[PDB]
Amino acid sequence: GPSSQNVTEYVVRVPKNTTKKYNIMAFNAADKVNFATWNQARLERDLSNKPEDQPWLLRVNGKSGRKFKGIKKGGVTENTSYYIFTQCPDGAFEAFPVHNWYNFTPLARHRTLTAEEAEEEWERRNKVLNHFSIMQQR
Amino acid sequence: HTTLRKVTANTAIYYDPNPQSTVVAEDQEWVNVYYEMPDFDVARISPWLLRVELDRKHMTDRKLTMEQIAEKINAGFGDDLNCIFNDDNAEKLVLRIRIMNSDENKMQEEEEVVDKMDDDVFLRCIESNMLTDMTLQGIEQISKVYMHLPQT
Amino acid sequence: YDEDDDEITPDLWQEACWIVISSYFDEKGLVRQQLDSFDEFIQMSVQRIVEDAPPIDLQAEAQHASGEVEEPPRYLLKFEQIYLSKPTHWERDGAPSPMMPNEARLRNLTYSAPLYVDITKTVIKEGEEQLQTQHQKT
Amino acid sequence: QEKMATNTVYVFAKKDSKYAYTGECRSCLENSSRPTSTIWVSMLARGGQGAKKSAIGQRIVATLPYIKQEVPIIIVFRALGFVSDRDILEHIIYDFEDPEMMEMVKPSLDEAFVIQEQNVALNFIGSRGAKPGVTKEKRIKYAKEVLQKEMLPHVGVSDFCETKKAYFLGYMVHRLLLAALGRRELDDRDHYGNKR
Amino acid sequence: RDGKLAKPRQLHNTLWGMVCPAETPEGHAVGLVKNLALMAYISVGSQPSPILEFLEEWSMENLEEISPAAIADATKIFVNGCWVGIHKDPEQLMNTLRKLRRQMDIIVSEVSMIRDIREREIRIYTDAGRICRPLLIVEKQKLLLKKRHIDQLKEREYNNYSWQDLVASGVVEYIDTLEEETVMLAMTPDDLQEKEVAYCSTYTHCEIHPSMILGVCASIIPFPDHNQSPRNTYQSAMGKQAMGVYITNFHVRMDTLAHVLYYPQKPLVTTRSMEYLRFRELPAGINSIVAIA
Amino acid sequence: AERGELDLTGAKQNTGVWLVKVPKYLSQQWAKASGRGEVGKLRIAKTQGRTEVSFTLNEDLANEHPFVLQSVGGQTLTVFTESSSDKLSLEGIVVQRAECRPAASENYMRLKRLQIEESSKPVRLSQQLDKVVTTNYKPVANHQYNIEYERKKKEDGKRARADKQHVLDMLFSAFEKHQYYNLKDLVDITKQPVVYLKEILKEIGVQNVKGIHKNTWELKPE
Amino acid sequence: FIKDDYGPESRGFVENSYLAGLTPTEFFFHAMGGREGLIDTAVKTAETGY
To answer: What are the coiled-coil residue ranges (chain C)?
Structure first.
């Protein structure tokens, strides 16, 4: 067993015939992500106000799920290269190149504050004087 | 010239609607002591509590008594500021502050001309200004900057 | 010849520190900061600056009021390695000769050297021509 | 010629009524085009609107390079895109076991509350920066390139390193908070270690 | 200009070994125009790129790959003021980088490295314009330079050798003012050896000699340590006024104005620092018989 | 757009993968295999209170790398794929991070230093010059200028003026395309002297200027 | 010196006389005592003239 003289060896392969790019989608554990309840998802480049340079939009379950923004890694490595290693039924290891690292973070749902009504103005008057009623009058 | 901020060891603000079962069980003896302390407007005063503790050496040094402090703070903020305090000879010298309203007229007439300010938040503004404003004995720009000297 | 084993007498006195000191001034000298800063300025700083970010392109304002066809003529300029000659002087005749710092002081010259740079012209026109490239030493 | 060392954070006390403490950072890739930019993050003192909460000695703000108006630091973070307060707090101090410093920043987070979207925060900085105009959208873009290029250029001049820059701003606010608590002595105005 | 009174005029402690103690204009700009000490040096500076690479091999974690709220114990590392990453064991890493520098795998007077153990931080610098000075490294409790190296320096008179060889041996190092804040520098081999009941015991560098703290003009004067210090500032100004032979080839020079002495003499009482000024070669005065009467 | 749909099969299968840090030089040695099969083998050695993981290179490709595991309790990492067929799929989830430590130490460095030579070396200033004058290899008739004259050397400097009526036809045709035109567009369009065309525009039209001397002419449509 | 060392010498007491000569640290702490007077001279001349 493991507590004894256990030795194990696996073959490692790095295929070149792959055509699909491999990317990382990272979450905070503090965000308590639950893939088990992701029934459906969308993933599209999203910068409609401004393809390969674009950040991501991740949309789970549509109107009844969470939505995230995907941001590009702060730079390529300058010494090492991150590789993805997968186990194969034959009993080998299989290694895959990372093309890119994207960071995904919480967007919120239908909250809509909108400081365009007169809230920048109201702030001028604000003495931490109100808080609830302004969110309601919208 | 010393400001209450210098005299204060520490401040705290507590949630306590029912003093008769206050979370500060050691003060509990004082609450029974102040059942007759306006026994009726305890149903009306805000459930927000400020408690202050004073440093023992520094308080004595100014030779102050609690009724002086209560009378000073009452005079500054007004009757609206309902104060009570413990005995100057207890081992933990403490001061307890609440805020009373205008009783009769506050019946949600228009929309409360305070724009619905939470009293806790207001208690910080009272706590801030109570410290920065109260000018007992010395009243202006000199305070106790003192030293005392023997000249021979 | 040293071994840090049979050696038992590391002691060394007032004499030897000056021997160290003498070797310092003898190798370095009494004005190295100036000289190293200037040597680094030519050998590094000027090359980096001409490579850094100055590619310029110009696209003619042709085909006005009438245009079609295929070409609003476009040019791009790039700058390569920098060359620096030995300090020179050009006599009124037109004949260059080496300049001697003593002569530079008597005749009141400026003791300086000519700087040359590699310039390139690239004509990636809007269609027909794309491989029109020529090298210069200027 | 002797100058103050670039790309280093310094904290100084001032006699100025408006600033209790200042964190200064000079940029200047003494290895680039040699532009400018000189960030101050300032701890405010002596004052109060009145019956606001008063307390002026927590209101941390930022001067960005010759922006015609001071900006609150949390707005800058929101402009960088980190809208979650738990995340902003983490970026300022990733050791939230200490309630006192976290309470110290707390009123500036409360002050920031009026806006919680990056676009709006960019438009806010634009109006606080740019002369009056009309459309919102160029203002957001103009504000974005300044926030990207002129805000600590030495940490990066591209989109793809906007997150890393945010980390450096936060250590800087942290560098500032340490001096205001007194956990760390002020920098010396003459220490040759901080000269070039 | 014209009336400022503050602290950038007095002699900060950190100038030690860096700028001249006494040697500053006796005039309006006292303490503002300074003169560089005798041994002091300046970095030309270079690209941090190879260090960043080396740091990455040494298991440095990248900012965007980590869990910030779960790794506060880790030391933060900075390069030219830029926050590159974090490390979880700064003592070996600091030890490794120092061994690497002393190996002359990375440039020495140009990669300065300082650790602030109180804040759990590691800061590194490789920009231009840092003033630094050379020091003898001492290890454990005993000096690292020894007799075979001196035998090579005497042989250097014909055999190929250099100060650079001496640095490649790793017996001497360059130290800038920021690092100099954290070292435990001992005045003389004497003190570091005699040290038995003394208070310290952990010296990490030593001075090659104390007299190197003085400028170039501060070096002409004999026994500056017996003179009241401003008397010595005054000589540093006056030496620059004294006349003598100022370069060899003056005769073919139409210098707009010049003064030469007929008979210069080298001084009878001289400082060792004067050998390296060549003040023997071109002296500025005469040995007078003086009577103080 | 179905192209924007993200496949969750992998996620729903709870597929796990490993994330490993390895040097560009190790992967460059791996690149020589060119996917022909394998680059080597990974070995796992487990004892009483220790686990030793390592990779060993193929004897063939070479014609011990220890692994250090990292924590992943404070972050979640997953792998999603981007196909050339424009389809996205979450192929699986990262369950572990690690770093590959080099067995060779100080001599490796020489290779590194050799590697340093490979990354860093375009010649900087470097060889100077001993030669000097070359420039101004005498054009006597400037080479571009020659080409421009050559362009001129194909029937230029003479205009119709002279064909008046046919020129009027061009004016009428042009005016059919738009109500007003700049003088410069008419000069391009009718290839005649400007002053003569002005006398025609005085004859059958008027002029209308705006801004900074920006003038357009029109045959008074009505 | 050691961090936090309030002893006389370590913080600027000169044990020696000008005749025996100053030790190296004392000399630099003496050079510091030398500046305050040179600077004081340059300021007082400007202010009093005014």
So the answer is: none
Do A120 and D124 lie within an 8 Å CB cutoff? Answer: yes
Q: What is the dihedral of CA D23, D2, E129, F123, to 10 degrees?
A: 110
Tokens of F89: 């799929």
Least CB-CB distance to C16: which of E150, E212, E275?
A: E150
**DSSP-derived secondary structure letter, A74:** S
CA D89 to chain centre: 14
Give the closest residue to D78 by CA, choosing from D119, D111, D110. Answer: D119
Kindly compute the dihedral angle of the four CA atoms of residues F29, F30, F36, F37, in this order, to the nearest 10 degrees.
Answer: 130
Residue ranges per domain, chain D?
8-196
Structure tokens at D12: 């100084």
Q: Taking CB atoms and an 8 Å cut-off, how many pairs form between chains A and E?
A: 19
Find where tokens 């459930």 sit: B47
D22 with D186: CB under 8 angstroms?
no
CA angle E162, E167, E173 (to 5 degrees): 140
In angstroms, this model's resolution equals 3.9
Longest dimension (CA), chain A: 74
Question: Could you give the CA distance from residue C42 to residue A42 in angstroms, rounded to a whole number?
Answer: 56
What is the per-residue burial (b if ≥16 Cβ within 10 Å, else e) of D166-184? Answer: bbbbbbbbbbbbbbbeeee
Q: Hey, are the CB atoms on E105 and F113 less than 8 Å from each other?
A: yes
DSSP H stretches of helix in E63-176: 90-102, 147-155, 163-168
- Whole-number Cα distances in Å, B93 to B14, B16, B90, E14: 18, 20, 6, 51
Strands F6-7 and F88-100: parallel
**Phi, psi of G45, deg, nearest 5:** -60, -40
Q: What is the dihedral of CA E236, E241, E245, E249, to 10 degrees?
A: 100
The residues that bridge with A106 in the sheet, in sequence order, are A68
Q: At C2, list the tokens.
A: 């040293």
Residue with tokens 């990490």: E204
Alpha carbon separation from F27 to A83, C13, C127, E205, F34 (Å, rounded): 10, 55, 41, 43, 11
Residue D89 to chain A, least CA–CA distance (Å): 14
CATH of D8-196, one of 2.60.40.1120, 3.30.70.1400, 2.60.40.1510, 3.90.1110.10: 3.90.1110.10
CB C86 within 8 A of CB C100: no
* CA nearest to A8, candidates D180, E165, F45: F45
The tally of CA atoms less than 13 A away on the side-chain side of residue B119 is: 18
DSSP-derived secondary structure letter, C81: E
Q: At what angle do helices F194-204 and F164-177 cross, to 10 degrees?
A: 70
Least Cα separation, residue E8 to chain D (angstroms): 7
Q: Considering only alpha carbons, which residue of chain G is nearest residue E4?
A: G43
Give the pair of three-digit tokens for residue D52. 């606001």
Q: Do F81 and A23 touch (CB under 8 A)?
A: yes
Q: With an 8 Å Cβ cutoff, are A80 and E57 in contact?
A: yes
What proportions of chain D, in percent to the nearest 5, are helix, strand and coil? 45, 15, 45
Q: Residue C136 region, left (φ>0) first, then alpha (ψ -120 to 50), else beta?
A: beta
> Which of F72, F33, F91, F30 lies closest to F55 in space, CA to CA?
F30
- On whether any CB of chain F is under 8 Å from the CB of C97, the answer is no
Domains of chain B: 1-133 (3.30.1360.140)
Report whether G34 contacts E20 (CB < 8 A).
Answer: no
CB contact (8 A) between residue F101 and residue E59 = yes
Query: Do the Cβ atoms of C57 and C68 come closer than 8 Å?
Result: no
Residue of chain E nearest D183, judged by CA positions = E119
Annotated binding site of E for RNA: 241
